[PDB]
Amino acid sequence: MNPPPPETSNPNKPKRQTNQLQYLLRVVLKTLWKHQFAWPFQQPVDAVKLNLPDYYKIIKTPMDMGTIKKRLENNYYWNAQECIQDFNTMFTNCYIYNKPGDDIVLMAEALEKLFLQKINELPT
Ligand SMILES: CC(C)N1c2cc(Nc3nccc(-c4ccccc4)n3)ccc2N(C)C(=O)[C@H]1C
Structure with missing residues (x-):
């Protein structure tokens, strides 16, 4: 039931490491990561473990903070x-x-x- 996770590396994308993007990784994501309620959002929804065969039959653009983190560390994004x-x-x-x-x-x-x-x- 678990689809492949969203892509986190793509050498072909145009990449940047703006001040804003560095701040989103070093300050924003890393503070969110330590929040007491972060743990359900630190990796893709594991529909097999949760026995929710419906989840990915409803949510067609999945996203989680583990993916965002890997994207930021790979400079996946063009802007913040x-x-x-x-x-x-x-x-x-x-x-x-x-x-x-x-x-x-x-x-x-x-x-x-x-x-x-x-x-x-x-x-800025
Ligand atoms: C609704 C729940 C199934 N939910 C979810 C679950 C987890 N992981 C997890 N693992 C063990 C127990 C629980 C759990 C059990 C009863 C009440 C509240 C939590 N949740 C991780 C992410 C998600 N997200 C983001 C959702 O949108 C849906 C799919």
Whole structure:
């Protein structure tokens, strides 16, 4: 049931290491990574382990912080907005598949609040 994980290395993509991208890796992701509620988002959803054969039949653009981290470390992104879009996909996937008030949603919401606080001001 588990599809292959999203791509994290692509030598053909045009890469950059902007100040903003470095900050997203060194400050934003690494602080989120240590949050008490980070653990469900640190790797792709393992639908086999969770016995959720429906998950990837609903969520067609999966994303997780482990993937974002590998992408940042591989300079996969051209700008910070591309990386922020991946974070937003991760959060939105959770809000789509689950319902308001579910425990996993409360965890995603806590992470998102921290994420939005940290990216409110980015380097120049
Ligand atoms: C809804 C839940 C299945 N959920 C999820 C689960 C995990 N991992 C995990 N492992 C053991 C127990 C639990 C668990 C069990 C009952 C209540 C709350 C958590 N969750 C990792 C990520 C996700 N995300 C991001 C989702 O959107 C969906 C797929």
